[PDB]
Each structure stands twice: as C-alpha cells, then as structure tokens.
Amino acid sequence: PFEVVFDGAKEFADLIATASNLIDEAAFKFTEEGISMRAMDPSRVVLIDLNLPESIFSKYEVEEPETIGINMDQFKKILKRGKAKDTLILRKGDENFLEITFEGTAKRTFRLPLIDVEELELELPELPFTAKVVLLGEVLKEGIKDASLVSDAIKFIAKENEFTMKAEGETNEVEIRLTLEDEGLLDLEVEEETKSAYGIRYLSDMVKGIGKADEVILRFGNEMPLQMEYMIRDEGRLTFLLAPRVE
Amino acid sequence: PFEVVFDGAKEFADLIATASNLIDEAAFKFTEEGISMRAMDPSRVVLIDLNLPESIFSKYEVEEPETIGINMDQFKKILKRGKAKDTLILRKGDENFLEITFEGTAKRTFRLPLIDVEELELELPELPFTAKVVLLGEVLKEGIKDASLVSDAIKFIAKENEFTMKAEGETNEVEIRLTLEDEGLLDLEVEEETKSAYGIRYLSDMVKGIGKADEVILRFGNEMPLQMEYMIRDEGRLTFLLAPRVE
Amino acid sequence: PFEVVFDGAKEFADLIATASNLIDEAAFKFTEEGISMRAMDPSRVVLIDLNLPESIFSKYEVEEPETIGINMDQFKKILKRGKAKDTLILRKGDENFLEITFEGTAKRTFRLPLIDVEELELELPELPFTAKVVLLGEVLKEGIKDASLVSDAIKFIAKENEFTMKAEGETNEVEIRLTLEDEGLLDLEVEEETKSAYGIRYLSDMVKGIGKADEVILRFGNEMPLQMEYMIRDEGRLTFLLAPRVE
Amino acid sequence: KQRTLESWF
Amino acid sequence: KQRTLESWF
Amino acid sequence: KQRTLESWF
Numbered sequence: 001p002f003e004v005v006f007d008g009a010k011e012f013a014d015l016i017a018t019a020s021n022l023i024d025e026a027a028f029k030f031t032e033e034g035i036s037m038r039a040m041d042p043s044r045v046v047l048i049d050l051n052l053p054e055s056i057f058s059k060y061e062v063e064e065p066e067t068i069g070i071n072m073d074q075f076k077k078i079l080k081r082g083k084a085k086d087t088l089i090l091r092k093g094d095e096n097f098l099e100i101t102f103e104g105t106a107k108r109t110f111r112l113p114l115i116d117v118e119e120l121e122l123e124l125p126e127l128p129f130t131a132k133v134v135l136l137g138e139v140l141k142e143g144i145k146d147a148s149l150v151s152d153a154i155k156f157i158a159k160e161n162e163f164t165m166k167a168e169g170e171t172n173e174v175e176i177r178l179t180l181e182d183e184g185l186l187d188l189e190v191e192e193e194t195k196s197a198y199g200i201r202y203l204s205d206m207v208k209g210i211g212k213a214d215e216v217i218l219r220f221g222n223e224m225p226l227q228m229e230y231m232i233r234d235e236g237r238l239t240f241l242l243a244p245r246v247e
Numbered sequence: 248p249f250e251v252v253f254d255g256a257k258e259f260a261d262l263i264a265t266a267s268n269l270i271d272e273a274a275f276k277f278t279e280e281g282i283s284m285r286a287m288d289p290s291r292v293v294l295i296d297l298n299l300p301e302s303i304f305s306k307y308e309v310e311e312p313e314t315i316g317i318n319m320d321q322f323k324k325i326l327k328r329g330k331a332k333d334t335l336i337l338r339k340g341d342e343n344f345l346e347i348t349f350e351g352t353a354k355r356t357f358r359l360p361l362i363d364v365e366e367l368e369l370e371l372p373e374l375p376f377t378a379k380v381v382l383l384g385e386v387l388k389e390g391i392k393d394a395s396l397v398s399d400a401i402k403f404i405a406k407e408n409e410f411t412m413k414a415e416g417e418t419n420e421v422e423i424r425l426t427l428e429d430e431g432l433l434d435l436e437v438e439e440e441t442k443s444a445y446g447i448r449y450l451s452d453m454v455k456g457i458g459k460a461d462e463v464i465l466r467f468g469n470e471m472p473l474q475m476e477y478m479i480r481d482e483g484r485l486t487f488l489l490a491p492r493v494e
Numbered sequence: 495p496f497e498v499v500f501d502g503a504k505e506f507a508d509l510i511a512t513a514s515n516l517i518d519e520a521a522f523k524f525t526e527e528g529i530s531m532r533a534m535d536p537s538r539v540v541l542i543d544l545n546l547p548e549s550i551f552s553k554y555e556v557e558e559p560e561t562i563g564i565n566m567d568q569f570k571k572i573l574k575r576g577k578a579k580d581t582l583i584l585r586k587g588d589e590n591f592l593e594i595t596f597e598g599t600a601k602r603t604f605r606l607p608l609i610d611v612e613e614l615e616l617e618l619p620e621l622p623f624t625a626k627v628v629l630l631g632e633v634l635k636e637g638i639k640d641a642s643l644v645s646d647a648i649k650f651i652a653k654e655n656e657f658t659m660k661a662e663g664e665t666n667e668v669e670i671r672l673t674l675e676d677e678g679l680l681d682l683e684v685e686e687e688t689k690s691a692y693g694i695r696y697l698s699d700m701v702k703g704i705g706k707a708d709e710v711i712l713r714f715g716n717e718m719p720l721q722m723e724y725m726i727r728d729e730g731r732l733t734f735l736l737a738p739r740v741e
Numbered sequence: 742k743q744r745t746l747e748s749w750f
Numbered sequence: 751k752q753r754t755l756e757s758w759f
Numbered sequence: 760k761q762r763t764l765e766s767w768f
C-alpha cells in the first residue's frame with residue numbers, strides 16, 4: 001500500500017517507455033527509501049536499474065512496503081496518456097492492481113492489473129572500468145544514429161584526451177570524436193587506453209529517452225560491459241549495464 | 248447563385264473534415280439567413296447539423312437561394328489545401344459546380360462538380376435531456392482517447408457535482424472525473440442522476456475537429472442520445488446527435 | 495585533393511536531397527572557381543545544373559582540381575545527418591573516397607566510397623524563352639500540390655499581366671493565378687502570350703527543397719522546356735531544365 | 742446494442 | 751507526350 | 760559475438 005505523487009507525468013512516461021523497449025515485464029520495489037526496479041532483458045545482454053529516491057516525489061507515502069509486477073508495454077501505454085502539465089499519482093491498496101492517475105484539467109484514473117514477475121537477484125558487480133566519459137546526450141544519440149548507417153555494431157575508444165565512437169561496414173565508415181576542447185565532452189578520465197564494442201540496436205533503445213542536453217555517464221573497459229547512466233530529477237537515476245560485442 | 252466569403256480557410260476545412268468522417272455526401276442549403284446542412288450517417292446512428300449564419304462571413308451574397316449536393320471527401324480534399332492565412336470564397340453561378348477559391352499570396356480556384364444528394368428531412372426532436380455538461384474540448388478529446396485504450400464503449404454519468412466518463416474492459420478500466428472545482432468543467436446542470444453509453448469510434452470522429460480550449464456542450468439523458476455542440480466563429484454551430492449504446 | 499567548408503549543413507543536405515530524387519548518380523567537378531555538377535535523369539527529361547562558387551564557402555581549398563563520382567542516395571543519407579548548427583566539411587586526398595565531416599558539439603566524420611560516373615557533356619543551349627516569371631516558392635510549391643489533386647500534368651500560361659498554372663481532370667479543375675498586384679509575383683516579363691505543359695511528378699521533385707520565401711525564376715516558351723532556378727547562399731544556383739509535355 | 746436514432750425521429 | 755530534352759541538345 | 764552479462768554475475 002502506497003500513494004506516490006510525481007510532478008510531470010511525461011518525464012516519468014519516458015523512463016518506462018525506454019525500459020519497455022528492453023524488457024517485457026518488471027518488478028517494482030516500493031520501499032520507504034524510494035522506488036527501485038532491476039531487470040535483465042530475456043537474452044541477458046542488458047541490465048536495467050532504475051532508482052527513484054523518495055526525495056524526487058512531491059508526496060511519498062508507503063504505508064506498507066511492497067513489490068509489484070508490471071507488464072511494461074501496458075504501463076507505457078497508460079503513462080503515455082499523461083500530459084506535460086499533469087501531476088502523476090501512483091496508488092495501491094491491498095488489491096492486486098495499480099491505480100495510475102493524471103491530475104490536470106481533469107482527474108483521469110486508470111486501473112492496471114498486476115502480474116507475477118520473478119525477480120532474479122544479484123547486485124551490481126564491482127567492475128574494474130578503465131574509462132569514464134561524461135558527454136551530452138545529443139552527441140551520444142547522434143553518434144549511435146550515425147553509426148547505424150554503416151553497421152550493427154559500434155566501437156568505443158577512450159584515450160586520455162579523446163573519446164571516439166566508430167562504426168565500419170562495406171567501404172562506409174563513421175567516426176564521432178570528442179576532445180576535451182569540445183562542448184559535448186564534459187569529462188574524460190582514462191586509466192589506460194580503452195576499447196570495447198557494443199550493439200547498436202541495444203544502444204538505440206537505451207538512449208531513446210535521453211534528452212539532448214542531459215549529462216550521460218559512460219563507464220567501460222577493454223572488452224567489458226558498458227555502464228550508462230543518466231539522472232532523473234537530479235536524485236533519480238537510470239543505469240544500464242550492456243554486455244560487449246567481442247571479436 | 249451565391250458568393251460567400253469566409254476569413255480563415257483552415258477553420259472551415261476542419262468542419263468539413265470532421266463531417267466527412269461521418270458522412271460520404273451532404274446537401275448544403277444556402278439561404279439568405281446563412282448556410283445549413285443536416286445529414287445522418289448511413290447507419291442512422293449519428294445526426295450532423297451544421298449552422299453557419301450569414302453574420303460569420305465577411306461577405307454573404309446569395310442572389311438566388313439554393314441547395315447543393317456535395318461529395319464530402321472531395322470537398323475535404325480541396326478545403327485542406329487552404330492555408331491559415333487564406334481567405335476562403337465559395338461561389339456558384341447557374342452551372343452545376345462549386346467554385347472554391349483561396350485568396351492569399353495567390354488566387355487558387357478549384358472547381359468541384361455537384362451531385363444529387365437526397366435530403367431526409369425531419370427537424371430535431373425536442374428531447375427531455377436531464378443533464379447538461381459544458382467542458383473544455385481538451386478533457387473530452389483526452390477522455391475519449393483514454394477510454395479507447397480499454398473498450399469500444401464509454402459510459403457518461405452525471406450527478407449534481409460530478410461528471411464522469413468511464414470505460415471498462417478486460418481487467419483494465421479508466422474513469423475521467425470532473426467536479427465543479429475543476430478547470431475543464433465550465434457548467435454542470437443535472438435534473439436527476441443521468442447515465443448513458445456511447446460508441447468510442449463515433450465519439451472520436453465527432454471531436455477530432457474540436458479545439459483543446461473550445462467550449463463543448465453535452466446534453467444527454469438515461470439511455471438517450473447524446474447531443475454535442477460546439478461553436479464556429481461564435482455564431483456558427485456544429486451539432487451532433489448520437490444514438491446510445493444500450494445493454 | 496581539396497578541403498571545402500560550408501556553414502550550415504542542412505541547407506547543403508537539402509540540395510543533394512532534391513537532386514537525388516531526380517538522379518541516382520552524379521559527377522561533381524571541384525574547380526578553383528567552385529563546385530559544379532550537371533546531369534540528366536536517365537529518361538533524359540530533366541537536366542540539373544548545380545553551381546556553387548567558391549565565394550559561398552567559408553573555406554575553399556582545392557589543391558588539385560578533380561571530378562568525383564557520387565551515389566546520390568548515399569550522399570543524401572549521410573548529409574541528412576547534418577544538424578542546422580553544424581559546419582560541413584568536404585575533404586578529399588588522393589584516395590578514392592570523400593570525407594564528409596560535421597563540426598558542431600562533436601566532430602562526426604563519414605567516409606563515402608567514390609564511383610565511376612560517365613559525364614555526358616554539352617552546355618546549356620541558348621533557348622528563345624518568351625516568358626520570365628519570378629514568384630515566391632510558396633506559390634509554386636502550393637500550386638503544384640494543388641494541381642496534383644486533379645491531374646498528372648500542369649499547364650503554364652503567361653500573359654503580360656497574369657501568370658496562370660492550371661490543371662484539369664475528370665470534371666475537377668484548378669487554376670492558380672498571379673497578377674502584378676499579388677505578393678507572390680515578383681516579376682513577369684512576357685514577349686508574347688506563352689503556353690506550355692509539364693509533368694507534376696517532375697515538378698514536385700524539383701521544388702521539394704525550395705523554401706516558401708525563396709525567389710524562384712521560371713523561363714519558358716510555347717511548347718518549350720521550362721527553366722527553373724533558385725539561389726543558394728545568394729551566389730550559388732540550382733538550375734533545372736524540364737522538357738515539356740506536348741499534345 | 743448500438744441503437745439507431747430512428748425511435749427519436 | 752512527355753518530350754525528352756534531346757531535340758534541345 | 761554478442762556476450763551475455765552472465766560472466767559478470
């Protein structure tokens with residue numbers, strides 16, 4: 001049982017929409033600390049970790065902590081009815097459905113049946129990332145679209161004063177380069193020259209909900225997974241871990 | 248024979264576009280008082296009444312009163328060529344075609360052949376409506392789209408301080424509620440608690456051309472037709488009568 | 495070998511996009527004077543002449559004059575990745591590929607393989623055009639779309655104080671008329687009353703990249719080709735010659 | 742059932 | 751008939 | 760080859 005209120009329904013809708021393109025179902029943990037959700041896509045190539053602390057909500061009242069199972073495409077469907085001006089309310093009693101309400105010019109309440117979703121659970125492993133890149137969502141989103149013209153895969157290369165994404169196909173190539181002089185490169189910390197490759201299909205889904213001016217943190221290593229995170233209402237966080245393409 | 252001039256071609260285009268989604272052909276009566284059009288869709292579930300008094304036109308010159316038959320999809324096609332800035336002219340001599348002209352940066356004249364449309368004719372029956380609801384088009388348009396997520400039908404319920412639209416399907420439900428405190432509820436007059444249901448497909452077509460900030464009047468009764476009207480250039484009026492879904 | 499820099503990648507992209515809808519491949523001549531390109535579509539109905547003098551580039555450095563063959567749909571594909579803010583760089587060494595770079599928040603470099611395109615070559619014939627029409631792109635683009643509602647062909651008629659485009663089909667007609675009083679008619683010079691007809695499909699492709707407020711020059715004659723030109727960054731020019739539809 | 746308007750004409 | 755440009759080259 | 764995340768769990 002809970003009542004949780006979030007100002008700006010579309011921003012919340014975008015989160016769920018991104019997640020729904022990677023996973024079909026998720027378990028959402030409503031704790032006193034905030035909402036958390038963790039899942040892998042069925043092929044176990046990508047991990048999603050959503051963390052929305054209670055502080056980003058205008059009201060956060062969890063009378064009884066609870067984990068609820070949700071069909072992501074139907075959650076998306078409903079949340080996409082929210083207008084930018086709408087206040088979002090997520091409310092749950094003892095019954096097995098979630099009440100989603102948009103408060104704006106009218107009060108619009110949807111009832112979503114809840115389902116059984118089995119949580120796999122181990123926490124994030126501590127990985128020895130040798131490169132950290134902070135860049136504008138614009139560059140990331142662009143570069144991924146650029147690369148898809150040419151390949152199904154994109155190579156990330158980090159050296160101490162340059163970050164490059166490159167894709168090659170059949171004669172055609174593209175390289176997207178940032179140096180510390182560039183606007184869109186906010187930070188670059190490199191322990192050792194770092195190279196890994198990733199699938200464009202996954203990347204595309206991952207960055208769809210990212211804003212052009214959002215600050216996105218990339219962490220990766222040589223033939224290691226990519227960790228990608230961006231902030232939600234400052235304290236919230238959506239984190240992806242994406243397994244590499246090797247050879 | 249007539250020459251009738253209307254400032255703002257797109258607003259006129261929108262009217263015809265809405266009407267064309269409900270009916271294939273219509274008879275337009277050009278009288279000294281203004282233009283009128285009345286038709287039912289072929290399944291006789293919805294009635295359209297368009298009334299455009301002479302006062303809303305910048306020039307209204309009907310040398311000879313006349314009723315002309317029009318293919319609505321072709322009328323729409325042409326009218327949709329009108330730009331927001333364009334002045335619309337509808338002109339007819341003795342010949343059996345309508346001249347549609349857009350005056351803006353250029354003079355653009357289309358000739359539309361006229362056809363034979365049989366008018367059915369009885370006037371609006373005086374119905375004992377027990378509920379009047381005046382609401383912003385935004386709420387109506389929203390709520391109909393909300394309901395279509397869940398059902399093919401929507402129930403209207405009017406009580407003395409609340410208007411609710413609700414839809415139910417397979418586990419999923421939505422309710423859109425207005426109270427007299429809400430922005431989007433401009434008036435609610437209720438004689439007795441009133442309930443009726445209507446088809447979402449019809450409703451969707453009906454409200455497509457309604458503006459988000461337009462004031463829309465709903466009149467209905469227990470298992471009675473819904474009367475929906477909105478204003479055109481203040482004095483003009485488009486009225487629908489929609490038969491109920493019962494049981 | 496060259497490095498050529500153009501501020502505003504999307505404007506350049508639009509040129510190529512238009513051209514690519516008419517031709518599949520083109521030879522681009524990089525001279526000390528500027529870039530030139532001339533081609534006919536395979537059916538030899540339309541001629542494209544692109545002329546971009548060195549003066550419209552922010553940097554124009556052709557170490558060695560050269561003609562390069564380009565697949566237009568792939569050139570378009572890449573150029574359409576350019577944002578409005580991007581600086582465009584076209585660079586070529588001795589190798590047989592073109593480097594296309596967008597400089598904005600990041601540096602994004604594509605490599606496009608070059609191909610063998612056989613130039614047909616005779617220059618523009620001096621034609622005895624009897625009508626010159628200068629009009630806003632808006633009117634031209636509109637009128638072509640208007641006419642396509644009605645026909646596959648459009649007749650151009652020039653008299654000393656009016657320019658008319660008209661299309662007829664099956665009962666339906668449209669006429670788009672300009673007189674010297676009209677906004678969208680900037681100039682009309684007529685030697686003798688002039689009439690010719692042209693294909694709407696070609697015209698549509700030709701004017702797709704034209705701006706609503708662009709000044710477009712039309713030159714034609716009785717059953718002669720139409721010459722259509724508009725300016726690129728003032729000194730640049732894209733010229734079409736379109737063979738007439740006769741009988 | 743989707744009624745027609747006939748009963749009301 | 752859609753003429754080609756050939757007569758004019 | 761598209762690795763899975765399993766080796767890292």
